[PDB]
Design a protein around this ligand. Structure first.
Ligand SMILES: Cc1ccn(-c2nc(NC3CCC(F)(F)CC3)cc(N3CCOCC3)n2)n1
Ligand SMILES: Cc1ccn(-c2nc(NC3CCC(F)(F)CC3)cc(N3CCOCC3)n2)n1
Lengths: 144, 272, 162, 108, 144, 144
């Protein structure tokens, strides 16, 4: 990591901080986003910092910031792309998918497969042993 | 991986700068050669070869630099998308654009001496005219297409569209930093400069192009006059008319049509 | 007889410069059919020009997600100049005071040069602050009102109920 | 005048949005189905087969990126619609209701 | 009925229901109409859902949804137009019109009749027996 | 002061005081601002009054604003500008600056000095005895 990149991060990392206390605030982010023309809800503001944390304190710092800045700068990550395309067909949102609509969509919805491939796919990923298929476990297993 | 990315970025930028330097030299030498051939020396002199071998050498080096640049960008794609074989990055669109770049950049007036018959219908009197022209006139003018490298150099050298934090924020917002975005940004930051630079550049370029085309079938010094071409382009851009100056060749009419379309676009933009 | 308007490319050029309202060149129809066709072309072109005028003003405007990033870039670029200007003005003030008080012999060319640079520092600081204010009050105007109005309505209803 | 007359009316936009959403919902599903198919087929051809044929694996890895890009583009088009759809909500309609509610809350 | 129409109707009925339960909710309709750009009132939503219904509760399903699709595809050159024609001159919402109002309207407002026809119409429409004409019964009598 | 200058500001004062009271309150100013298209908050109105407050009283009379006038037409003031220049680098807002930050900004930001000048400036600014420099008195000392 070049020192120029580190300085470029530290600049505009000192942003989101109207007091220079070396820490983040759930109100400083709201003020900054109001300055830029947005106004998210309190739950959304909480989730914005919740989706990147590793201590549970509700406060991140330079290491986590650099951790997230390492990504979000490249091209296709090949992980979020498969994280979505399940939620499209996932209705309730708990994280389970029935084993019949999967067959229906794979046999009907665009560049359809054949019966052999669908049967093989259903025979595979049978860790659960029930109709409720856990797509999250299918990820990190078919793409490990 | 950050060091590898930085090295690739630097190498790509340096290759772009060298390509621009080696293209502008060829354009300038072509301009000087065309100006001085209608005069001091003919096409059979030693100066003709002495000044076309320079053009050929510059073209060879330019082709080499472009190919190396494309190899570098394929390596950068492999690094970004996480691939191990280079054949994954080769789609039909990429091949088509690479071939188009090579074909456009590989035209120049080759050394030699060849002739050609040219018949034109004079304007306002409808009287035919026959001359004998040079094949270099068909090969030299298409060289103005090289001017697309200035856009690449300016885009790569811009500090506003290069900061890592801005790219990260744009990625978080799920937008792409393509050429439409940068064009739309400059059309709001400073539209006057954008509309002025392009007008002046097209102005001189087209005014010279009409004269270089039409000096062949012209004897009374009307459209072969630099200031006459400048006045013609000015009143065709603004849609006032033609006066008593009409091209005798289809090249002049094509240039005038391009000028008119660009003028209508610029007028609407200035209205906004 | 002289192959002027019976030439396909001549007709193409004539129609192109009549659609755009540039002129006629050397090419005028010898028949009323040509004049009628040219008039139709001219009317159609006059309409199409206004339509394109309407279209460009809509197709050259940024969307909301692009504004959200444009504002961030502009702010993070202005914050640097608002600090360089202040550094320069403080430097000039210190140099003026030093060279006018803490010295044995007073040299007036240096003092005049520093008093000349002081005013430029002040003007630059003022201009940059004006640009920052313009950006702020032009940016804080694209916030929607439907969601906030719905939230206020729900809160008022709950307060009235309880 | 032409700019005045070009735009649609309110009742026309209220059905134009419905038609657009009905069309977009199908493409956002076709793209996802293609993504899932490509992922499964890549995994099968790279693990379950006793031998390995690299041309087929390479072709499927090439199609994967196409599928991802198409899905992303369609989702962006779907997002663009809501921004101009929610700007048609009036303010004076709910202004009176909120004013009356505030007055009633203050009175009682 | 060609299966394409049934498939299209089912695909449309997939909308208005972002739960997969196959039951139209008075809040799901509000959310959908908010998405489309409208903000109807609760009473207006209740009236819209109560305009067509079979069971007592405010529940509409696909069998209760495909009933009016056939009716809404034609041109309503029926008693529906006469309904608004009567309601235009109906001051209050009860649904009764005074006879003298009919006399004046028919004899004065546009392509006026002659008093003989008006008297004949009133005599034929002497079902109320008092003068408070009920237009619903008259509509049923005329259109049958 | 010429007779025309004395007669001036009278129409403006009458515009501000549309009551005949003879003194300027914190409500007539709000009405005037509302008329001109602005809606400042109560704190902003109080601060605007305080910045021209005569001694302590929360009201403004005609002799009060004559003092403010003939000062807002002098272009460079050479004190307020230095005030904002200090305030730019002042974070908390109490009115004190750390010496290390001053050294860093003077040796790095904009046109840069050398260590001799910065050391001399800090030594001449050592009228505090601590890290906090109290630039307010430093402004008076520098501007003489
Ligand atoms: C213009 C602007 C500035 C910041 N923006 C932004 N910040 C996000 N979160 C980060 C989390 C780590 C942090 F420390 F950087 C704080 C903020 C998330 C986010 N998103 C994702 C959700 O859809 C809306 C865009 N945008 N956008
Ligand atoms: C854009 C849009 C989407 C739906 N719209 C709409 N839906 C209506 N009711 C339906 C009837 C069939 C049903 F099963 F879906 C239950 C709800 C009524 C209605 N109206 C009539 C009253 O004046 C306003 C328009 N519009 N409009």
């Amino acid at each position: 990591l070049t020192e120029e990149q580190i300085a470029e991060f530290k600049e505009a990392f000192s942003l989101f901080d109207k007091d220079g206390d070396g820490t983040i605030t759930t109100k400083e982010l709201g003020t900054v986003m109001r300055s830029l023309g947005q106004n998210p809800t309190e739950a959304e503001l909480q989730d914005m910092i919740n989706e990147v944390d590793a201590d549970g304190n509700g406060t991140i710092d330079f290491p986590e910031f650099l951790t997230m800045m390492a990504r979000k700068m490249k091209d296709t990550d090949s992980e979020e792309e498969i994280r979505e395309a399940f939620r499209v067909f996932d209705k309730d949102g708990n994280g389970y998918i029935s084993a019949a609509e999967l067959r229906h969509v794979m046999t009907n919805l665009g560049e359809k497969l054949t019966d052999e491939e669908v049967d093989e796919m259903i025979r595979e990923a049978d860790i659960d042993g029930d109709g409720q298929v856990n797509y999250e476990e299918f990820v990190q297993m078919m793409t490990a | 991986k950050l060091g590898h990315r930085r090295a690739l970025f630097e190498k790509r930028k340096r290759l772009s700068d060298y390509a621009l330097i080696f293209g502008m030299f060829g354009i300038v030498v072509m301009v000087i050669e065309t100006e001085l051939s209608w005069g001091a020396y003919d096409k059979a002199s030693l100066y003709s070869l002495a000044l076309k071998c320079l053009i050929s050498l510059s073209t060879i080096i330019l082709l080499g630099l472009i190919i190396v640049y494309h190899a570098r960008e394929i390596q950068l794609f492999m690094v970004d998308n996480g691939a191990d074989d280079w054949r994954i990055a080769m789609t039909y669109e990429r091949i088509f654009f690479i071939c188009l770049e090579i074909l456009v950049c590989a035209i120049h007036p080759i050394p030699g001496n060849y002739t050609f018959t040219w018949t034109a219908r004079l304007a306002f009197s409808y009287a035919p005219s026959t001359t004998t022209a040079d094949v270099d006139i068909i090969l030299s003018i298409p060289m103005f297409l090289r001017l697309y490298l200035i856009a690449r150099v300016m885009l790569l050298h811009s500090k506003l569209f290069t900061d890592a934090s801005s790219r990260s924020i744009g990625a978080l917002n799920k937008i792409n930093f393509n050429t439409r975005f940068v064009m739309k940004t400059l059309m709001t930051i400073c539209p006057g400069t954008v509309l002025l630079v392009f007008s002046i550049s097209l102005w001189i370029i087209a005014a010279w192009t009409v004269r270089a085309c039409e000096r062949y079938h012209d004897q009374q010094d009307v459209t072969s006059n630099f200031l006459g071409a400048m006045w013609l382009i000015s009143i065709t851009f603004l849609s006032i008319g033609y006066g008593d100056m009409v091209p005798n060749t289809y090249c002049g009419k094509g240039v005038c049509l391009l000028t008119g379309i660009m003028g209508a676009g610029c007028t609407a933009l200035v209205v906004a | 007889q002289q192959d002027v308007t019976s030439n396909f490319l001549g007709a193409m050029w004539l129609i192109s410069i009549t659609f755009l309202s540039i002129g006629y060149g050397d090419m005028v129809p010898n028949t009323y059919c040509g004049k009628g066709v040219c008039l139709l072309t001219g009317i159609m072109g006059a309409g199409c020009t206004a339509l394109v005028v309407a279209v460009v003003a809509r197709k050259l405007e940024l969307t909301k997600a692009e504004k959200h990033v444009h504002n961030f870039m502009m702010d993070t670029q202005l914050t640097k100049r608002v600090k360089n200007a202040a550094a320069n003005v403080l430097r000039e003030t210190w140099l003026i005071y030093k060279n006018t008080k803490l010295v044995k012999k007073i040299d007036h060319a240096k003092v005049r040069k520093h008093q000349r640079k002081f005013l430029q520092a002040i003007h630059q600081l003022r201009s940059v602050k004006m640009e920052q204010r313009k950006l702020n009050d032009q940016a804080n105007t694209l916030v929607d009102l439907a969601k906030t109005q719905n939230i206020m309505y729900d809160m008022i209803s709950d307060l009235n109920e309880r």
